[PDB]
Amino acid sequence: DYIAHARQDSSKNWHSHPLQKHLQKVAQLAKRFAGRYGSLFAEYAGLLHDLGKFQESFQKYIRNASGFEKENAHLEDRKIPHSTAGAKYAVERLNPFFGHLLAYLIAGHHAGLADWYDKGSLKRRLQQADDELAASLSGFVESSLPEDFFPLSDDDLMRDFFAFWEDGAKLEELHIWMRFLFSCLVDADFLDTEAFMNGYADADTAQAAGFPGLDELHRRYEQYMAQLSEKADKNSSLNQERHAILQQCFSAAETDRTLFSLTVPTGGGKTLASLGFALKHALKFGKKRIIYAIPFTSIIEQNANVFRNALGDDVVLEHHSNLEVKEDKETAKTRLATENWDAPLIVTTNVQLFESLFAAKTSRCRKIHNIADSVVILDEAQQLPRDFQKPITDMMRVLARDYGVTFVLCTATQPELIDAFGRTILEGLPDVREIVADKIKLRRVRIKMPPPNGETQSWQKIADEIAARPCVLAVVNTRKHAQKLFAALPSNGIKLHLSANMCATHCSEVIALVRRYLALYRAGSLHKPLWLVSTQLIEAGVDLDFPCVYRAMAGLDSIAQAAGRCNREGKLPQLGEVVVFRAEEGAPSGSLKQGQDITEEMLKAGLLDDPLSPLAFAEYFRRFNGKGDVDKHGITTLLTAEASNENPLAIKFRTAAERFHLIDNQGVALIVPFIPLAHWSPQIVEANELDDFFRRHLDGVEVSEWQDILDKQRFPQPPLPEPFESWFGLLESDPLKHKWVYRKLQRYTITVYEHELPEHAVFSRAGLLVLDKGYYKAVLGAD
Ligand SMILES: [Fe+3]
Ligand SMILES: [Fe+3]
């Protein structure tokens, strides 16, 4: 009888997945995921997606080919194509609009959603599909299944369609709906197949064989907040303000609205307050999960640790980079190991989030349906790339209005107090409710700006200014700038280096070491000056407190975030010293260059005598929102649907997805074999335990010995370096059974530019790109 998949277990026996069962299960699970959002369309797509496997040629292939080809016989990427039979059947048995709509989902369920005319042209595939359809229907008739196994009804689709589109379909919003249904199809297909791979009858069965609910998470959060309150009852200025913010968040959580903002002072508890708002709001309005998306130029780990401490290990899913195998190493198992964000708390970048929302491929689109009915927290949303701000805010508008999503725009840009101005965080959204509107104290820093005449300082001159000072955090705008400044510093200090040339784990270890030095510094007990050279990745969620911060010229919000690491708690008996300098030009994205330009023009307008003032912030956001092309790459008209009697439904999914890939200048992921610190069977130190680790091995020890102690705790090697070698072998044996390795490798990835080039510098392994250890240095990372 007809099968959908075949697999071979480690004892070399063969198991097969019955086709009829898989079609029914995928239909039902897709309809379940699609919920109230026109689920009949998803059901039909699940029912039809594998119709082409009824071809006798397909069943013959899956029974007669080699072991590897039999296990990968459904990966059409010669294989026997099967995805387009069900697409053609939909077109033939339904009206033009519904039929072609479904054809997009069904025919893309392996290759990704296509363009109509151009890339992967769905028009050509349909015009060439008569044989595949006829053979599939032959097979289906030959089989046992009842005549009405495919009960395709225009009228029922009409009713479901108009239930979702009360006013008919908007040609410019149609792609969001089709991508959502495509997500339902893909996630249900993959989950059912993964059930089969583990021997279970269906996805529900595997689920019941073996995540706390948001109620338990909320109770944990309350326990954690209460012990934070008791543990450090400062009864201080800062604790008072944090309390006021938390109370306003808890109050605003009851409001029946979809767009909120949370504007607080730096060090004001932005993350924990946003999480409390989100938990309570989610419980009151039936949101199913919380998504926390931070700027791409961040250390995700450092933000995620707050959530890990508040709510425990098993709840937080950390997902930033794309660890995709190259197409040539895609197998059935790697295909199934993709992320669907079914976890209740997700920590991610806004690039991962919105590039998934605009994607064509199944690996990126799988997670999409789990975003509906969620709370999404955008940390510093105003830094979303300006040139994509129109599609992104259009996306957000639709998701908030029609798909149950709540957005909270968090920013630490509350001005230093005459607060007679509001701000528009994102120029394109409907009205956004500000959570902290109750007002009212003491200054924390003094800020110095570069000269209006526009002159720049050499790296040596800036290093000389820094080296004249006992303790400085210096923040620069690019990795090369970090290298040049670090090199320029003298060798009589303790100097350290952070940039995105370093993997997360390396960064977190440097951060913990800096904490130890700082604790010594604050007791008057560090015998060398302390200089940390970092990029902007430190301003996004790293909690460090320096007495002096040097900041390269940048947008006023970036300057405020930098000052947030200078006398952060307001505990020092003198104001912090913040020096904004103008060096060699540079910036990692056109949007950050735009911020720099706005700050320069404000400086030339004499508006920055008090750079954190209400006047300064209002002027910065008005000028920023007056500048830049908000859809530079034409996303909106690429994804706007064109209809006609000849071409019922034309959308450029494939071209749009590829064009959106420029949101980060085509970032390519790269795995780096940085040997981590571990403790004794060697176990790598958990990311939120590093601080305790450094205290246990270093407290009471002279600084002159620290390095040797640290070097002794590196992950032990055998008599690629070890953890990596075992990990890659685990991926090679069975990447779905050991898919957890993928998540581990996320801490040892950096992203570089497709532009940059030695021959064996980079190799491939387990389908993933890896850098040879010779090219990754202990201080600077890669180059
Ligand atoms: Fe398929
Ligand atoms: Fe399938």
Numbering used by the authors: 4 to 80, 87 to 219, 224 to 430, 434 to 456, 461 to 700, 705 to 743, 755 to 791, 795 to 821
Quote from the publication.
Among many types of CRISPR-Cas systems, Type I CRISPR-Cas systems are most abundant, with target interference depending on a multi-subunit, RNA-guided complex known as Cascade that recruits a transacting helicase nuclease, Cas3, to degrade the target. Cas3 is a multi-domain protein consisting of approximately 800–900 amino acids in the Type I CRISPR–Cas system and is responsible for the actual cleavage of target DNA. Our structural study revealed that, like other types of Cas3, NlaCas3 is distinctly composed of three major domains including the HD nuclease domain, RecA-like helicase domain, and CTD.
In the present study, we elucidated the first structure of standalone Type I-C Cas3 from Neisseria lactamica (NlaCas3). Following purification, the target protein was successfully crystallized, and its crystal structure was determined at a resolution of 2.17 Å using the molecular replacement (MR) phasing method. The crystal was categorized under the space group C2, with a single molecule present in the asymmetric unit. The overall tertiary structure of NlaCas3 exhibited a typical structural fold of Cas3, compactly arranged with the N-terminal histidine–aspartate (HD) nuclease domain and RecA-like helicase domains positioned adjacent to each other, thereby forming a functional unit that is capable of DNA cleavage and unwinding. Two prominent round-shaped electron densities, characteristic of metal-ion density, were observed around the active site of HD nuclease of NlaCas3. This metal ion density was coordinated by O and N atoms from the side chains of residues H8, H25, H52, D53, H118 and H119. Additionally, ICP–MS results indicating a 2:1 ratio of Fe2+ to Mn2+ binding indicated that the metal ions in the active site of HD nuclease domain corresponded to two Fe2+ ions. Conversely, in our isolated NlaCas3 structure, Fe2+ ions, which inhibit NlaCas3 activity, were detected, indicating an inactive form. When comparing our standalone NlaCas3 structure in its presumed inactive form to the structure of Cas3 bound to the actual substrate DNA within the Cascade complex, we observed that the HD gate loop from the HD nuclease domain and RecA1 gate loop from the RecA1 domain in our NlaCas3 structure blocked the active site of HD nuclease. When we compared our standalone NlaCas3 structure with that of NlaCas3 in complex with Cascade, the anchor loop of NlaCas3, which is utilized for binding with Cas8 in the complex, underwent significant structural changes when NlaCas3 was present alone and positioned in a completely opposite direction.
